[PDB]
Design a protein around this motif. Structure first.
Motif, PDB file in Angstrom:
ATOM      1  N   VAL A 104       0.856  -1.179   0.000  1.00  0.00           N
ATOM      2  CA  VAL A 104       0.000   0.000   0.000  1.00  0.00           C
ATOM      3  C   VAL A 104       0.889   1.225   0.000  1.00  0.00           C
ATOM      4  N   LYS A 105       0.908   1.954  -1.109  1.00  0.00           N
ATOM      5  CA  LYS A 105       1.720   3.126  -1.244  1.00  0.00           C
ATOM      6  C   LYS A 105       1.377   4.119  -0.127  1.00  0.00           C
ATOM      7  N   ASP A 106       2.424   4.720   0.442  1.00  0.00           N
ATOM      8  CA  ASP A 106       2.347   5.683   1.536  1.00  0.00           C
ATOM      9  C   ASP A 106       1.956   5.061   2.856  1.00  0.00           C
ATOM     10  N   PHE A 107       2.003   3.732   2.882  1.00  0.00           N
ATOM     11  CA  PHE A 107       1.566   3.050   4.099  1.00  0.00           C
ATOM     12  C   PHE A 107       2.616   2.033   4.488  1.00  0.00           C
ATOM     13  N   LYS A 119       7.888   6.678  11.877  1.00  0.00           N
ATOM     14  CA  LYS A 119       8.796   6.918  10.775  1.00  0.00           C
ATOM     15  C   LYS A 119       8.661   5.785   9.761  1.00  0.00           C
ATOM     16  N   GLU A 120       9.095   6.067   8.557  1.00  0.00           N
ATOM     17  CA  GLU A 120       9.330   5.069   7.540  1.00  0.00           C
ATOM     18  C   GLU A 120      10.393   4.056   7.981  1.00  0.00           C
ATOM     19  N   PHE A 121      10.299   2.879   7.376  1.00  0.00           N
ATOM     20  CA  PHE A 121      11.293   1.821   7.416  1.00  0.00           C
ATOM     21  C   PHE A 121      11.410   1.133   8.792  1.00  0.00           C
ATOM     22  N   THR A 155      -2.212 -12.068  18.021  1.00  0.00           N
ATOM     23  CA  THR A 155      -2.268 -12.956  16.868  1.00  0.00           C
ATOM     24  C   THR A 155      -1.016 -12.827  15.989  1.00  0.00           C
ATOM     25  N   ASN A 156       0.145 -12.671  16.651  1.00  0.00           N
ATOM     26  CA  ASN A 156       1.410 -12.587  15.919  1.00  0.00           C
ATOM     27  C   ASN A 156       1.805 -13.968  15.395  1.00  0.00           C
ATOM     28  N   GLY A 157       2.085 -14.048  14.109  1.00  0.00           N
ATOM     29  CA  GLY A 157       2.476 -15.298  13.462  1.00  0.00           C
ATOM     30  C   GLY A 157       3.824 -15.127  12.786  1.00  0.00           C
ATOM     31  N   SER A 158       3.798 -15.157  11.456  1.00  0.00           N
ATOM     32  CA  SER A 158       4.977 -14.928  10.642  1.00  0.00           C
ATOM     33  C   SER A 158       4.897 -13.650   9.824  1.00  0.00           C
ATOM     34  N   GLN A 159       3.717 -13.084   9.637  1.00  0.00           N
ATOM     35  CA  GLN A 159       3.593 -11.941   8.741  1.00  0.00           C
ATOM     36  C   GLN A 159       4.108 -10.670   9.411  1.00  0.00           C
ATOM     37  N   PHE A 160       4.801  -9.870   8.605  1.00  0.00           N
ATOM     38  CA  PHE A 160       5.437  -8.651   9.041  1.00  0.00           C
ATOM     39  C   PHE A 160       5.131  -7.562   8.016  1.00  0.00           C
ATOM     40  N   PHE A 161       5.367  -6.315   8.420  1.00  0.00           N
ATOM     41  CA  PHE A 161       5.330  -5.237   7.461  1.00  0.00           C
ATOM     42  C   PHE A 161       6.461  -4.253   7.763  1.00  0.00           C
ATOM     43  N   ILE A 162       6.800  -3.502   6.714  1.00  0.00           N
ATOM     44  CA  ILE A 162       7.784  -2.437   6.780  1.00  0.00           C
ATOM     45  C   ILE A 162       7.024  -1.161   6.465  1.00  0.00           C
ATOM     46  N   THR A 163       7.040  -0.197   7.414  1.00  0.00           N
ATOM     47  CA  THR A 163       6.359   1.049   7.168  1.00  0.00           C
ATOM     48  C   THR A 163       7.084   1.815   6.071  1.00  0.00           C
ATOM     49  N   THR A 164       6.324   2.657   5.347  1.00  0.00           N
ATOM     50  CA  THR A 164       6.924   3.521   4.342  1.00  0.00           C
ATOM     51  C   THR A 164       6.637   5.012   4.581  1.00  0.00           C
ATOM     52  N   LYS A 165       5.907   5.297   5.638  1.00  0.00           N
ATOM     53  CA  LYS A 165       5.603   6.630   6.154  1.00  0.00           C
ATOM     54  C   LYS A 165       5.330   6.430   7.644  1.00  0.00           C
ATOM     55  N   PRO A 166       5.250   7.503   8.429  1.00  0.00           N
ATOM     56  CA  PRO A 166       4.747   7.381   9.805  1.00  0.00           C
ATOM     57  C   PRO A 166       3.322   6.852   9.753  1.00  0.00           C
ATOM     58  N   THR A 167       3.011   5.890  10.624  1.00  0.00           N
ATOM     59  CA  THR A 167       1.719   5.258  10.738  1.00  0.00           C
ATOM     60  C   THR A 167       1.291   5.209  12.217  1.00  0.00           C
ATOM     61  N   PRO A 168       1.176   6.342  12.893  1.00  0.00           N
ATOM     62  CA  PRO A 168       0.993   6.324  14.337  1.00  0.00           C
ATOM     63  C   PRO A 168      -0.264   5.656  14.809  1.00  0.00           C
ATOM     64  N   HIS A 169      -1.286   5.597  13.972  1.00  0.00           N
ATOM     65  CA  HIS A 169      -2.530   4.951  14.361  1.00  0.00           C
ATOM     66  C   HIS A 169      -2.373   3.448  14.613  1.00  0.00           C
ATOM     67  N   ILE A 175       9.641  -1.868  -3.893  1.00  0.00           N
ATOM     68  CA  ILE A 175       8.505  -2.713  -3.556  1.00  0.00           C
ATOM     69  C   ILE A 175       7.239  -1.869  -3.395  1.00  0.00           C
ATOM     70  N   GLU A 176       7.369  -0.768  -2.654  1.00  0.00           N
ATOM     71  CA  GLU A 176       6.240   0.091  -2.340  1.00  0.00           C
ATOM     72  C   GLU A 176       5.565   0.641  -3.598  1.00  0.00           C
ATOM     73  N   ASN A 177       6.337   0.868  -4.650  1.00  0.00           N
ATOM     74  CA  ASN A 177       5.827   1.479  -5.877  1.00  0.00           C
ATOM     75  C   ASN A 177       5.290   0.449  -6.878  1.00  0.00           C
ATOM     76  N   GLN A 178       5.223  -0.803  -6.522  1.00  0.00           N
ATOM     77  CA  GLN A 178       4.671  -1.804  -7.434  1.00  0.00           C
ATOM     78  C   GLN A 178       3.183  -1.552  -7.692  1.00  0.00           C
ATOM     79  N   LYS A 179       2.776  -1.752  -8.943  1.00  0.00           N
ATOM     80  CA  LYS A 179       1.360  -1.758  -9.248  1.00  0.00           C
ATOM     81  C   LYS A 179       0.719  -3.017  -8.638  1.00  0.00           C
ATOM     82  N   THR A 180      -0.458  -2.845  -8.064  1.00  0.00           N
ATOM     83  CA  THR A 180      -1.108  -3.920  -7.356  1.00  0.00           C
ATOM     84  C   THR A 180      -2.509  -4.222  -7.878  1.00  0.00           C
ATOM     85  N   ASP A 181      -2.958  -5.417  -7.562  1.00  0.00           N
ATOM     86  CA  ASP A 181      -4.269  -5.926  -7.938  1.00  0.00           C
ATOM     87  C   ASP A 181      -5.316  -5.423  -6.974  1.00  0.00           C
ATOM     88  N   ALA A 182      -6.543  -5.954  -7.065  1.00  0.00           N
ATOM     89  CA  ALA A 182      -7.643  -5.474  -6.313  1.00  0.00           C
ATOM     90  C   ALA A 182      -7.516  -5.792  -4.817  1.00  0.00           C
TER      91      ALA A 182
END
Ligand SMILES: [Mg+2]
Ligand SMILES: [Mg+2]
Length: 172
Positions: free
Chosen positions: A64-67, A101-103, A114-128, A149-156
């Motif tokens: 998700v761009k900016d996220f 912050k990003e990154f 419900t922590n498993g294996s999935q992770f994310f890398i922020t690309t902007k501040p996401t304080p919420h 990665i962040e700039n990839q075109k994505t599906d629905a």
């Protein structure tokens, strides 16, 4: 010392570079150990999923761009799967580190504890996301790879049309 882990990324089978993370094992040791072991594959087979506890060949399935950019669903490749090295999911360890912050490297989840294996890398501040997702590390190198990665075109479902694959991974 805090551990350092890496991913070598390919985008449609074309190498894109290496991302290196520092893990805040002093803040979130159980969370960091899970991620570290998913990078090395050293804990073997997931209890419920019966697939390797390993990010090798895994995808970044949600962008998700900016996220954020998100991966680590080794068993289903689409957000439905995954598991921790402890069997099933584990509890939210600490909310001490802010998504300011990003990154930053943080745990994806499907609700409380419900922590498993999935992770994310922020690309902007996401304080919420503070109080909802556990931040446990940060990119030290390969920021430009994350941006690609962040700039990839994505599906629905926000899945890249390109395969964003972890070709190799491990601990430094
Ligand atoms: Mg708790
Ligand atoms: Mg939530």
């Amino acid at each position: 010392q805090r551990p350092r882990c890496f991913f070598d990324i390919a985008i449609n089978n074309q190498p894109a570079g290496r991302v290196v993370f520092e893990l805040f094992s002093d803040v979130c040791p159980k969370t960091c150990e899970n991620f570290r072991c998913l990078c090395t594959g050293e804990k073997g087979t997931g209890k419920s999923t019966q697939k390797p506890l390993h990010y090798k060949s895994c995808l970044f399935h949600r962008v998700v761009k900016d996220f954020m950019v998100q991966g680590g669903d080794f068993s289903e490749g689409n957000g439905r799967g995954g598991e921790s090295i402890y069997g099933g999911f584990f509890e939210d360890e600490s909310f001490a580190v802010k998504h300011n912050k990003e990154f930053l490297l943080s745990m994806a989840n499907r609700g409380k504890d419900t922590n498993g294996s999935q992770f994310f890398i922020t690309t902007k501040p996401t304080p919420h996301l503070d109080g909802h997702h556990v931040v446990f590390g940060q990119v030290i190198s390969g920021q430009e790879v994350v941006r690609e990665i962040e700039n990839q075109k994505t599906d629905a479902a926000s899945k890249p049309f390109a395969e964003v694959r972890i070709l190799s991974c491990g601990e430094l």
